[PDB]
Structures are given as structure tokens and as C-alpha cells.
Amino acid sequence: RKHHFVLVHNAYHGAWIWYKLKPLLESAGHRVTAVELAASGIDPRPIQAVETVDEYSKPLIETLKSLPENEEVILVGFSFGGINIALAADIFPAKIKVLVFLNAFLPDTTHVPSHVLDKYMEMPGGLGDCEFSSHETRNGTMSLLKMGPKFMKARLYQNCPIEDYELAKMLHRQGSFFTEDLSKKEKFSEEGYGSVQRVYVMSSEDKAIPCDFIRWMIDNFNVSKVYEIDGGDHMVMLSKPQKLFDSLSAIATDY
Amino acid sequence: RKHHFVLVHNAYHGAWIWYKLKPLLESAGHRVTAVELAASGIDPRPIQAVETVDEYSKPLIETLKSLPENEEVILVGFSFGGINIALAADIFPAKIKVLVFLNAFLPDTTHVPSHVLDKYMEMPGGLGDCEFSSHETRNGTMSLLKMGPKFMKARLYQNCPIEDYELAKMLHRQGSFFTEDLSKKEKFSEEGYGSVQRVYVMSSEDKAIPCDFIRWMIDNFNVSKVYEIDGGDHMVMLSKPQKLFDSLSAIATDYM
């Protein structure tokens, strides 16, 4: 059978990252919706205009809200999109058969929502030539970030065709992890987010989110299955689009 | 010898269209600058905030303005980018070694700047599922347009990998031809735009700008050479990126 995949991109990026995967899915007869979150991609809003993670995810929530009733989706969250889908699952858990965490941050149901993001930022190394900034909001300061080209090439796009790195340099935008908003947020519920089925999909060569951090997350909060994509970098939908399709196709079958 | 290519995209698109060509050029040892015009791509401005063609091209003019002194570029204008480069050539003619009109509107030095755009809009065919709109400005109404998916697929991306049509659907924005602003504008000068070296590069299968309209334009206003890319659609930098590279590489050699 065929399913409806809702694809949710990562921060500093947009729906455009799914341009290789979307036709592969649709060509197999699945329906695909590539959500464009706020201040992301060609969204007209600056990131300064998006002060809470809730506003950031609004387009995703809006997509599920207006979903034909009784329809269920495969919700795919890439990277920071993992927080987004957890957010959405806690509102519309019954519109989601399975949550797919693709090289994503996998939040738990026990600590503040920002937990795995904080534990991540505490890792040694820093972030290459990324540019940290701050922004005062109605509710304290919001931490902003824009990636640097060297950081992107070395830790996100190492296995991508050069065209895709170049394309990213032309499209990536300043964004946020909303670590501050998320720290003040009510923890994800077990009745909502917790009740939804969830699997993990990880690239074997993810240099943005270390394999061991990924394992600490899954350890911290179990999933039904863990699929691995051999040779994928962080941007596995650009480096290994076909293998990503194979993974999601296996997921669709299992669920 | 290696040159500095300045790439200027078309309306409703952005710098992102050059993602296949940029590395081909740079890999051959040319330097590449893919300008992002106003209200284009990930530019934070709505098109409603850009009321004149001058504002639209400002990033291009700004790029040439801050160019190292005595440096000359190969300025590539794609589609409506042809008007943009003609605009720029009329300001900084000496910073430009050759103008490359890629499936572009080639304005002359005789009629109002909007001329070839008007003559274009008068042609039968219409524009599929494109969405026409208007917008009141400080200087009368501005005509806006947003492409429709069917129109794009059939007349711009017919020869492109499906991924690139899908990518475009995710990135194209509402834009304008500034036909109204351009009609009120002083015609391009012969001392500026006219003095600069210009060639034409055309796709053999361009369904957005008909081969015969392209020939009427070149007829209307001659170029040094006309290169043809066999099998290219309108978006030739996405369908035939390597042949596009071959053409520009030939151009660089001829104007070396």
C-alpha cells in the first residue's frame, strides 16, 4: 500500500532539501508533503520575527490540522525537525501512524523539551565558522545561528555532490534552536507524543550529530526500530536519496 | 586564462539556479559570483517592497560597484536577467569584458527599455496557469506575476531532471517584469550599454522564449556571436549545465 509522507526539514534550511526524495517517494505512489516552517527557505519572515518554537512549527501543525479526517501520516523529522515532530505528535498523535527521526534530535518525555539540545551544545568542539548572535524578544533573549561554509562542507555535506553544497550555500538562512523557549516549555506528554510509534534513521557518517550522541538519545528514549544508512552524511536526503527512500519504504511496510 | 563570471538569474527565481554551473566554472579555475537580486530567492524583501527595476537590480550594481579596480567580468544575464545586465552595462561598461545573453531578453538602444518585453507579451500563447496580479506604488501600478506548476513544467523545465522541477516548485517566488517602470525609463545609451561586447547563447528547445522571437531580438540588435545549446530548455543551466559550461568556456576564450 501507499502512504502520505510529511517531510519536515532542519533549521537553517527549508523544504528544498527534499527535492531528490520527494519524486522518489511520489514515483512509488506515495503522497508527499514537504512542509516549509517559519523563517525557513523562501518563507517571507525573518528569524527575528519568529520568537517561539511554536510559531516556528506552526506551518507543520497547520498541515496536520487541515488533514482529511481519519487520515494518518508518516511524519519525518530531520535534525532539529525531530523537536518539531515531537511538538506536532503531542497535539495530533492520532494523525500520525509513525514518527521518523532522521538524524534528528529525539526528545524524551522526562526532561525539559530543550534537554537533548542542551546536552548537545555541551559537547566539546564548537561549530567551525558558524555565526552566533542574540535577539531580544517579548520573553527574554533568543539565540540565533547562521552556519559557515567550512562548517557546512566539513560536517553536513561531506558526502554530497558538490552541486548540493553549492545549492545550500545559496539557500541556507540564519535560524535558531529555540533552546531558550524550549527550556521554559512543558515537557512532552506520554499521552500524546509518547503514545505515537517512532523509529530512528541514522547515517553512518553523520558528522553533525555524532553516532554516540545519537545512541545516547535513543538509549535515553527508546524507538521501535533503528535503520542505518551506509555512507550517508548529515544531509542524507542529498547524499544518499535512494537509500533514504529504501529506509522509508521499509518503514512504510513495517507500519 | 581564467575569468570572473557574474551570473544573474531570471525573474521568479534566484541565485540557486546556478548551483550546477557554479562548480563547473570554479572547477575550471574561473571565479564565480551568483548575484541574488531583490525580492528574489531567499532575499527577505517581498516583491511588493521592490517598486522599480533599479531597486530590483541594486544587488547586481552593488556587486560591480565594489569590484576590485581594473577588474573586468563576464556578465551573464539569464532571461529577464538580460534587462538587468543591460542596466548594469549602462552604469559600469568598463567593468564588463563581455555581456552574455542566455535565453535572455536583449534590449536595444533605440526604443523604450520595456520594448522587447512588450513585444513579447503581445505574442499569442498566454501563460498557462501563471497568476497575474497588480500592486499600487508611488508611481502607478506595478504588474506582478507568479508562475503556475503546469506552465513551469511544460515551458521552462521540459528537459530538466524531475528533481529540478520539484526544487523549483519549492523555491520560485512571485516577481515582476517591471514593464511599467521600464516604459517610463530613459532608453539604454550607446555610449554605455551599446559599447560593451555582447554575445547570445540560446537553447534549441526554449519553450518560454520562442526561437523566432529570440531571432527578432538579435535581428533588432546585433551581437558578436550566437552560441546554441542543443537540447536545452529555457532552464539550460539545469538541463544542460555541462553544455552551458562549454558555451561560456568558448566565450571566455574568444574574449580573452
Numbering used by the authors:
A (entry chain B): 3 to 257
B (entry chain A): 3 to 258
What text comes from the article?
In 2007 a hydroxynitrile lyase from the noncyanogenic plant Arabidopsis thaliana (mouse-ear cress) was discovered (AtHNL) which exhibits high sequence similarity to the S-selective HbHNL (45 % identity and 67 % similarity) but quite unexpectedly was found to be R-selective for a wide range of converted cyanohydrins.
The only significant fold difference between the two structures is observed in a loop at the entrance of the active site. The PISA-analysis on the interaction surfaces indicates that the dimeric arrangement is also likely to be present in solution. While the R enantiomer has the hydroxyl group within hydrogen bonding distance to a potential catalytic base (His236), the S enantiomer interacts with a main-chain carbonyl oxygen, which is unlikely to deprotonate a hydroxyl group. In contrast to HbHNL (and MeHNL), however, the latter is not accomplished by a positively charged (lysine) residue but presumably by a combination of main-chain amide hydrogen bonds and a helix dipole more similar to the stabilization of the oxyanion in α/β-hydrolases.
